[PDB]
Each structure stands twice: as structure tokens, then as C-alpha cells.
Amino acid sequence: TGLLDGKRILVSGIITDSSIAFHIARVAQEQGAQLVLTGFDRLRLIQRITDRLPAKAPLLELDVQNEEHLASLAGRVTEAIGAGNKLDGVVHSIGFMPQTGMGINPFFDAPYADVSKGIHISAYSYASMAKALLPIMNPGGSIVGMDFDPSRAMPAYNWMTVAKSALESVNRFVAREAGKYGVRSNLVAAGPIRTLAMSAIVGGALGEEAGAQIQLLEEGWDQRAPIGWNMKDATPVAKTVCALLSDWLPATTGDIIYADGGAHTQLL
């Protein structure tokens, strides 16, 4: 027992109890992992949420757009897990795109300054995070990031889709670098999940305009999924991420694992 028994995994991206990163952390601990969490901006509020996990764990601040945060990351993580110890896993569950580039706003009306910001946080940070943490990762390690299949365009997602396409490409290169440390790098392309952020997006940025398309688009996942899809349950996704963090997918890297009920393999 204990899928991640005796493993040191840094999990990023927790902002609310609905965050995918929160469920990844939970299942991870339930499987015997010692976690190190990173938060952005409102650390106090994050701490409130994190304290609801199965076990306690170090919470460090990390704004992936801040050079010093990334420059001190390794040292700060080492102080947290104790000198002489290294990380066995890294979870990147960070994403962002201003309303201008994701929602009801026209595709052609997104200022690059906004798009660039979204790509910085959603894609480039996967590499900067890898750079800061690879030096303190043990062989057999695993870096995992969250993705949303951008192989085909769709309503509303717009520039966040572009950001995910960049992410998938960044992951392939991070895998080359990571390989030098005996570490694997992969993405988990999850089906739609009703996280607070997602729920806000779905509605708070479309009203009754795109609300239709997004409703249909959304309903399509469960229809297409041979084993169905429950947008209100992040657990299957969290389990998939822990699977990549374990030693049971030792020959897979620079890849993408789809945790979407099999929806992307079906047309109707």
C-alpha cells in the first residue's frame, strides 16, 4: 500500500478547495507522500485551504513571474524538506489568461500584452519551474503539468487554447532537459472540471451569448466518453497525476496522458 510511499512531491497551484491541485495533493498524501506546497499572492487564504488536507505540509510563496521567487525556490524548498534531501516529484497546476483572451471577448480583440502574460504563466513557467527544481530532484523523478487538449479549436477557450498548445511543446523540451537528471516530464490532459476558476469562466465571461456553445461543448464530454465524464469529480484526474508521479509509468516522458473518460478518442 502507499502508491507514493516515502516520496517528496512539490505540488503547486492551490487557490481554493476546488482547485485540481488541491485534489492532487490530497490523493498524493493519502498515498504516503510528503508534500511541499507553493502558493501565489494570498498565502494566508491558501494556508486556510491547505490546512484541510489529510496531513500538514510546508507552504512556500511562488509567483512564477517573479525572478527572485524562482531563483530562491530550490534553496527555500531544501530548507523545507531538509538539507541532504531532494524532491521526487513536481506538480505544475498553474494557469491563467486575462478575460480579454478567454471567454466571450472576440478572438481578435486580445492585446498581446494580455496574451503574453497568459502564456508566461501558463506555458513558459513549466520550463522555469523545471529549471529551478531539476537540480534538487532524484533520478526516477517525475514532473507533471496540467493540460487541456488544444489540438482542435473550440468556442470561448480562445487564447488559453494557444497557451496550452505552447505548453505541450514546452513539455517536450523540458523532457529532454529532465532526462539528463533521470527525470520524466509529462502532462495530464484532463476533461472539463468545475473548479471555481472554471465555473467563473463558464458564465461570468459569457452570460447568454456564448453560454450556449459552452453548454453544448461541455455536455459533449460525457456524451463522447465511453465511460462517461463527471465534471464535478476531480479525483480521477488527481489519481492519473499520481500515476505519473509513481514508478508505474517509468518509460513515458515528453508525453500527454488523457484523463477525460476517453472523450478525445471519440467523434460522437
Interface residues with ligand NAD (CB under 6 A) are 13-16, 19-21, 40, 62-65, 93-96, 121, 146-148, 190, 192-193, 195, 197-198
* 117 assigned ligand-binding residue: no
C-alpha cell belonging to residue 39: 502558493
C-alpha cell belonging to residue 68: 527572485
Q: Which stretch binds ligand 4PI (CB under 6 A): 43-51, 78-86, 93-101, 252-260?
A: 93-101
Q: Contact 189/237 with Cβ under 8 angstroms?
A: no
Tell me whether residue 182 or residue 235 sits nearer to ligand NAD (CB atom).
235
SS3 assignment, position 140: strand
Strands 59-61 and 87-92: unpaired
C-alpha cell belonging to residue 24: 492532487
Tell me whether residue 61 or residue 85 sits nearer to ligand NAD (CB atom).
61
Q: Contact 50/64 with Cβ under 8 angstroms?
A: no
Distance (Å, whole) CA 53 – CA 130: 25
C-alpha cell belonging to residue 211: 453560454
Q: Which stretch binds ligand 4PI (CB under 6 A): 83-91, 94-102, 130-138, 242-250?
A: 94-102
Beta bridge partners of 60: 38
Q: Is 24 in the site for ligand 4PI (CB under 6 A)?
A: no
Distance (Å, whole) CA 178 – CA 174: 6
Q: Is 218 in the site for ligand 4PI (CB under 6 A)?
A: yes
Hey, CA dihedral for 200, 206, 208, 212, is it positive or negative?
Answer: negative
C-alpha cell belonging to residue 142: 517525475
* 72 assigned ligand-binding residue: no
Hey, CA dihedral for 19, 1, 258, 145, is it positive or negative?
Answer: positive
Q: Which does 154 bind (CB under 5 to 8 A by kind): ligand NAD, ligand 4PI, none?
A: ligand 4PI
* 174 assigned ligand-binding residue: no
Q: Among residues 136, 122, 119, which one has the least CA distance to residue 40?
A: 122
The 181-210 contact track toward ligand 4PI, x by CB under 6 A, reads: -----------x----xx--xx--------
Tell me whether residue 138 or residue 213 sits nearer to ligand NAD (CB atom).
213
Q: Which does 65 bind (CB under 5 to 8 A by kind): ligand NAD, ligand 4PI, none?
A: ligand NAD
Q: Among residues 241, 252, 242, which one has the least CA distance to residue 184?
A: 252
Tell me whether residue 115 or residue 136 sits nearer to ligand 4PI (CB atom).
115
Q: Among residues 206, 178, 3, which one has the least CA distance to residue 90?
A: 178
Interface with ligand 4PI (CB under 6 A), residue from 43, 80, 81, 154: 154
Tell me whether residue 4 or residue 115 sits nearer to ligand 4PI (CB atom).
115
Q: Which does 94 bind (CB under 5 to 8 A by kind): ligand NAD, ligand 4PI, none?
A: ligand NAD
Residues in contact with ligand 4PI by CB under 6 A are 95-97, 148, 154, 157, 160, 192, 197-198, 201-202, 217-218
Give binding residues as ranges.
19-20, 63-64, 94-95, 157, 164, 193
Which residue ranges make up the annotated binding site for substrate?
Answer: 157
